Design a protein around this ligand. Structure first.
Ligand SMILES: Nc1ncnc2c1ncn2[C@@H]1O[C@H](COP(=O)(O)OP(=O)(O)OP(=O)(O)O)[C@@H](O)[C@H]1O
Ligand SMILES: Nc1ncnc2c1ncn2[C@@H]1O[C@H](COP(=O)(O)OP(=O)(O)OP(=O)(O)O)[C@@H](O)[C@H]1O
Ligand SMILES: Nc1ncnc2c1ncn2[C@@H]1O[C@H](COP(=O)(O)OP(=O)(O)OP(=O)(O)O)[C@@H](O)[C@H]1O
Ligand SMILES: Nc1ncnc2c1ncn2[C@@H]1O[C@H](COP(=O)(O)OP(=O)(O)OP(=O)(O)O)[C@@H](O)[C@H]1O
Lengths: 41, 494, 27, 207, 83, 83
C-alpha cells in the first residue's frame, strides 16, 4: 500500500534571457540619431 | 420604482439526449441582442502562462466598454458556456491537475461580479454532473436558479414524433396506414435522441428496399419516385435495431412464463380471483398504505409463473422482479445492498409492485445443522414493515416452497395473508390436461383413461411436461407403455 | 531565448554604424 | 459525382463469413448517401455518423475497417494509431484532435452541402476514451481530451462529411454519453464463423 | 470465491454458442466434504443449485452431465430432486 | 507465387540456466543485415506524459521508412524485447 508513481504534471513554457539592458542600449542610440537629424535642418 | 437587481444565471443539466443544446440554441436565437458567444469546451487553455485568463478578459472586454459607453441604457449581452465541468472541476481539494485552473476560476469569479458591478451579461451553462460544479460560484448574484431536465412521457412523446413526422405528412411521404398513438404506447422509457433514432431507423429499411445493389452499385430508379414509409417498418426496426438506453423495468417475461397459462380446473381460477381481489384492495385504500401476501405450494407447482401473471395483471407504473439468478457468487453483504436499492427505487413512484421469488434459496438454507445467512433475514424482516413516504403505496408478493421452515424462523407472522397452490389430484383432470395439450390421440387417450381411472394420481405440472417430452422419444408403438411405466415409477406419492 | 537575443544583438549591430554616418553628415 | 468506385467488387475485398454483417452495415451507414439527393431533400433526414466493432481476438475487425476505408470513392482516410495523440505539454492533445476536423469544417464552409467525405479511424479507442472520473492519478490530460472529442463530434455546429469508426475489445467500458444516438449508432459484434464460414475462409486464402 | 468465479466463467461462456454440453465430474470433491462434521462450503452448493435451473437465452440448448460417487450425501442436501 | 507472408514473431521460455540468451544472441548474429537493436527490460519507461509511446514508436520508424522507400527489396531488421 504505497501511493504509486505519478505522471509529471506537464511543461509550462517560460523563457527569459538578456533583453532588458540590451534593448535599453539599443534605444539610447536611436534617440541620439533623432537628435542629430533634428539639428541638421 | 422597485429598484431591484437582475438575475444573470441558470444552470442546465440532465441525462444525455434530453435537449439541453436545443434549449441553449433556441434561447439564444429568441433573445434579440449581440450575436451569441460560444465557448467550445476547454478551448481557452494554453501552454503559455497567463494567457488563459487573457482569453476570459477578451471574452468580457466588449461588454465593459459598451456598458461604460452607454451607461444605464446599455444593451444585454449573452455568453453560452459549454461543458463547464472541463474547466471548473473540483480544485476545492486544494490542488487540481494542471497549474492553470485555480487562477482561471478565480479570475472568472471576480470578473463576473467583483469590484465593478456589471449588469449587462447573461451566462448559460450546460453540463452532465452537478457535483463538478462548485458551490461557491452558484450563489446569489451569479447563479441563483437551477433546473433539472428529464425524460418525456407518452403525452409529450406524441408531440416529439408529431414534430418530426410532420414534414413526411406535409410531403405526403407518410403512408396513411400509420397510427402515432399505437407507436407511442409501445415505446416506453425512451429518451429524446432515441425517438429520432426510431424515425431514421424505420425509414432506413424502406430506403433500402427500393435500392437493389451489393455486387454492383447501381440505382434502379424504376421505383425511386414511388415510395411511402410502411407501418411494418417501425415494428421490424425497433424489434431488431433500437434498444432503450435504460434497459427495461419489465424484464424478459419469456424467461419466466414460457408457456402462458392453461386452465386445467377451478383452482387456478380461484388463485387469480384472489390476486385480483388483493391488488384491487391495495389500489383503493388509505388506512393501510402497505400490504403483503405470501404464496405457498408444493415444489414443481408453478408458483412463480402465477405470481408473475398476477403482477402483470395490475397496471401499476413500476413493476420489477428481484431473484437470486442475477446474484451468483455474491457475498453476504452485496445481497443486502441490491435488496436495499430495489426497495429504494420502489419508493419513488406513486404505485409499485415487487415480487420476491424463491425465498429459501435467497437465505442459503440447507438442512444440515442447519445453516443460513442471518443478516439477509434481518434485512428482509425490517423491509416488510417500512411504510413508504406519505401519500404513496406499495405491494409485495413473495414465494416459497417450505411452509414449515418459515414458521420455524417466526417470519410467517409478518405477512398478512397466505394462499395455497394445489396440484393435480384426480385422473379426470389429468385427462383434461392431456386433451388440452393435444399430444396423444383418441385411442391413446382412451387406453390411458382405463388406467388412470383405476386409482388416484399426484404429480406436478412441470414434471408431467418433462415426462411427456421424454416419452415422445421412444418408438410410436411403445410410447404409451413407457409413459405408464414412468408415471408408476414416479407415481409413489401420497 | 539565446538564439532570439543573439539575433536581436545582430539587428542592433547596424544602429551604431547608422548613427556614425548621420553624425558624419551633421559635421 | 458517384460516391463509390465503379471498379469495386464484393468478391475482391477478401472477406469471408461476414456477409450479413457487411450487408447490415451498408444498409445502415451508406444507404442515405447513394440515392439521388432529391429524395433526401423531401425526406429531410440526417445521416448517421458512427460505426463501432467489437469481438474476441482474431476475428477480422481491422480487415473490415481497411476495406470500408478503401471502398469509398473519396480522399485517402486519415489513420490514428492507438493513444498516439497524448503530448507532454498542456493544450496540445486537444489541438491535435481538433486539427483532424479542420479540413471537413473548411469544406463545409466553402462548398456547403456539396462536399466530399472525410474518414477517421480511432484504432484502439478504449485507450483514450474511458468513463469520466476514474483515472485521477495526475491526469494532466485525459478527461479534457474526451470532453473535447465529445464536443467536436457533435456540438452546436453541424457537419455532413464526417464518419467515425471505432474498434474495441471491451464494449462495456466506453462512456455512455458517447453511445447516444447521433454519435455512435451502428454497433456490430464480430463472432467466430461456422462450418460454412470456415469453408469460405479457407477457400479465399488458397486461391 | 475463486472457485465460484471460475465455474461462472465456463457456465457463461457456454451460453454464447447455440447448443452445447457441459460435464461436471467429482461433485463431492468440488465442494469440500468429509464425514467428520460434516463440513462443506455453502456458497458453491448454492451457486450450483442456482445454475442448474437457469435456462439459456431463448432459442439455445444445453445438456449438463454430472458424476458423483456418494448418492446418499447428495440426497440429504435436497439436490437429488433437481436432476 | 505462393502468396504468403513471412512470420514476424518468436518466443521462448523455460527454467533458469538453459541457454535462452545464448540462442537469442546467436540467431541475432546469424543474419547478414543491420545490427540488432536491444531493450533490457523496462528501459523505455519515462516520466513525461506520452514519451514512453514515442520511444516505442521510434524503434519502428526505420523499418517503415525502408518499406515505403524501397518496397519489395527492402532490408531486414531485428529487435529483442528481453524480459
Ligand atoms: N426532447 C427532445 N425533443 C426533440 N429532439 C430532441 C429532444 N432531446 C434531444 N433531441 C435531439 O437530440 C439530438 C442530439 O441530442 P441533444 O443535442 O439534444 O442532447 P444534449 O444532451 O442536450 O447535448 P450534449 O450531449 O451536446 O450536451 C438533438 O439534435 C435533438 O434534435
Ligand atoms: N397453468 C399453468 N400454471 C402454472 N404453470 C404452468 C401452467 N401451464 C404451464 N406452466 C408451466 O409451469 C412452469 C412453472 O415454472 P417454474 O418451474 O418457474 O415454477 P415453480 O414450479 O413454482 O418453481 P420451482 O422450479 O421452484 O418448483 C412455467 O414454466 C410454465 O411454463
Ligand atoms: N473474415 C476473414 N477473412 C479472411 N481473413 C481474415 C478474416 N478475419 C481475419 N482474417 C485474417 O486475420 C488477420 C488478422 O486480422 P485482424 O488484424 O483484423 O484481427 P483482429 O482480431 O480483429 O485484431 P486485434 O488483434 O487488433 O484484436 C488478417 O490478416 C486476415 O488475414
Ligand atoms: N547448451 C549450452 N551450451 C553451452 N553453454 C550453455 C548452453 N546453455 C546455456 N549455456 C550457458 O548459459 C550461460 C548464459 O546464461 P543463460 O543465458 O543460459 O541464462 P538464462 O537461462 O538466460 O537465465 P535467466 O533465467 O535469468 O534468463 C552461458 O555461460 C552459456 O555458456
Amino acid at each position: 500500500s504505497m501511493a504509486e508513481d505519478a505522471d509529471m504534471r506537464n511543461e509550462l513554457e517560460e523563457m527569459q534571457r538578456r533583453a532588458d539592458q540590451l534593448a535599453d542600449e539599443s534605444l539610447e542610440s536611436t534617440r541620439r540619431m533623432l537628435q542629430l537629424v533634428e539639428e541638421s535642418k | 420604482q422597485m429598484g431591484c437587481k437582475h438575475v444573470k444565471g441558470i444552470l442546465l443539466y440532465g441525462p444525455p439526449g434530453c435537449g439541453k443544446t436545443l434549449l441553449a440554441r433556441q434561447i439564444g436565437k429568441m433573445l434579440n441582442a449581440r450575436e451569441p458567444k460560444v465557448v467550445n469546451g476547454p478551448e481557452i487553455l494554453n501552454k503559455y502562462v497567463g494567457e488563459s485568463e487573457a482569453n476570459i478578459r477578451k471574452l468580457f472586454a466588449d461588454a465593459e466598454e459598451e456598458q461604460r459607453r452607454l451607461g444605464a441604457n446599455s444593451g444585454l449581452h449573452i455568453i453560452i458556456f459549454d461543458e463547464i465541468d472541463a474547466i471548473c472541476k473540483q480544485r476545492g481539494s486544494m490542488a487540481g491537475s494542471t497549474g492553470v485552473h485555480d487562477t482561471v476560476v478565480n479570475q472568472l469569479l471576480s470578473k463576473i461580479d467583483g469590484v465593478e458591478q456589471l449588469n449587462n451579461i447573461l451566462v448559460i451553462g450546460m453540463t452532465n454532473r452537478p457535483d463538478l460544479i462548485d458551490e461557491a460560484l452558484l450563489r446569489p448574484g451569479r447563479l441563483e436558479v437551477k433546473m433539472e431536465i428529464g425524460l418525456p412521457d407518452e403525452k409529450g412523446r406524441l408531440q416529439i414524433l408529431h414534430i418530426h413526422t410532420a414534414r413526411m405528412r406535409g410531403h405526403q411521404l407518410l403512408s396513411a396506414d400509420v397510427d402515432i398513438k399505437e407507436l407511442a404506447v409501445e415505446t416506453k422509457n425512451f429518451s429524446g435522441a432515441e425517438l429520432e433514432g426510431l424515425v431514421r431507423a424505420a425509414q432506413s429499411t424502406a430506403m433500402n428496399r427500393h435500392i437493389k445493389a451489393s455486387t454492383k452499385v447501381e440505382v434502379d430508379m424504376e421505383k425511386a419516385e414511388s415510395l411511402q414509409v410502411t407501418r411494418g417498418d417501425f415494428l421490424a426496426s425497433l424489434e431488431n435495431d433500437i434498444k432503450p438506453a435504460f434497459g427495461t423495468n419489465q424484464e424478459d417475461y419469456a424467461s419466466y412464463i414460457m408457456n402462458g397459462i392453461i386452465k386445467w380446473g377451478d383452482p387456478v381460477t380461484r388463485v387469480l380471483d384472489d390476486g385480483e381481489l388483493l391488488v384491487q384492495q391495495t389500489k383503493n385504500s388509505d388506512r393501510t398504505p402497505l400490504v403483503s401476501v405470501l404464496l405457498e405450494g408444493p415444489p414443481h407447482s408453478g408458483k412463480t409463473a402465477l405470481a408473475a401473471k398476477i403482477a402483470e395483471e395490475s397496471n401499476f407504473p413500476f413493476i420489477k422482479i428481484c431473484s437470486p439468478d442475477k446474484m451468483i457468487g455474491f457475498s453476504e453483504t452485496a445481497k443486502c445492498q441490491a435488496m436495499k436499492k430495489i426497495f429504494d427505487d420502489a419508493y419513488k413512484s406513486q404505485l409499485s409492485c415487487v415480487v420476491v421469488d424463491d425465498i429459501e434459496r435467497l437465505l442459503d438454507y440447507v438442512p444440515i445443522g442447519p445453516r443460513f445467512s442471518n443478516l439477509v433475514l434481518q434485512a428482509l424482516l425490517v423491509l416488510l414493515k417500512k411504510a413508504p413516504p406519505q401519500g404513496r403505496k406499495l405491494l409485495i408478493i413473495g414465494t416459497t416452497s417450505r411452509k414449515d421452515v418459515l414458521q420455524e424462523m417466526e417470519m410467517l407472522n409478518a405477512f398478512s395473508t397466505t394462499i395455497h397452490v394445489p396440484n393435480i389430484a384426480t385422473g379426470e383432470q389429468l385427462l383434461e390436461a392431456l386433451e388440452l395439450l393435444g399430444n396423444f390421440k383418441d385411442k391413446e387417450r382412451t387406453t390411458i383413461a382405463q388406467q388412470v381411472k383405476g386409482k388416484k394420481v399426484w404429480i406436478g405440472i412441470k414434471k408431467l411436461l418433462m415426462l411427456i417430452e421424454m416419452s415422445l422419444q421412444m418408438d410410436p408403438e411403445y410410447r404409451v407403455r413407457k409413459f405408464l411405466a414412468l408415471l408408476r415409477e414416479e407415481g409413489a406419492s401420497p | 531565448s539565446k538564439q532570439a537575443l543573439s539575433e536581436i544583438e545582430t539587428r542592433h549591430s547596424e544602429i551604431i554604424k547608422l548613427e556614425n554616418s548621420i553624425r558624419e553628415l551633421h559635421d | 459525382q458517384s460516391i463509390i468506385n465503379p471498379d469495386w467488387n464484393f468478391e475482391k475485398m477478401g472477406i469471408g463469413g461476414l456477409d450479413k454483417e457487411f450487408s447490415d452495415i451498408f444498409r445502415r451507414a451508406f444507404a442515405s448517401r447513394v440515392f439521388p439527393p432529391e429524395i433526401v431533400e423531401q425526406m429531410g433526414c440526417k445521416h448517421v455518423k458512427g460505426i463501432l466493432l467489437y469481438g474476441p481476438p482474431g476475428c477480422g475487425k481491422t480487415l473490415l475497417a481497411r476495406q470500408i476505408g478503401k471502398m469509398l470513392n473519396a480522399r485517402e482516410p486519415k489513420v490514428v494509431n492507438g493513444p498516439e495523440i497524448l503530448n507532454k505539454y498542456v493544450g496540445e492533445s486537444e489541438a491535435n484532435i481538433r486539427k483532424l476536423f479542420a479540413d471537413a469544417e473548411e469544406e463545409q464552409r466553402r462548398l456547403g452541402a456539396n462536399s466530399g467525405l472525410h474518414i477517421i479511424i480511432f484504432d484502439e479507442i478504449d485507450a483514450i476514451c474511458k468513463q469520466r472520473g476514474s483515472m485521477a492519478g495526475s491526469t494532466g490530460v485525459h478527461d479534457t481530451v474526451v470532453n473535447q472529442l465529445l464536443s467536436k463530434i457533435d456540438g452546436v455546429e453541424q457537419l455532413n462529411n464526417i464518419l467515425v469508426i471505432g474498434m474495441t475489445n471491451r464494449p462495456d467500458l466506453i462512456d455512455e454519453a458517447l453511445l447516444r444516438p447521433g454519435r455512435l449508432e451502428v454497433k456490430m459484434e464480430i463472432g467466430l464463423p461456422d462450418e460454412k464460414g470456415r469453408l469460405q475462409i479457407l477457400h479465399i486464402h488458397t486461391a
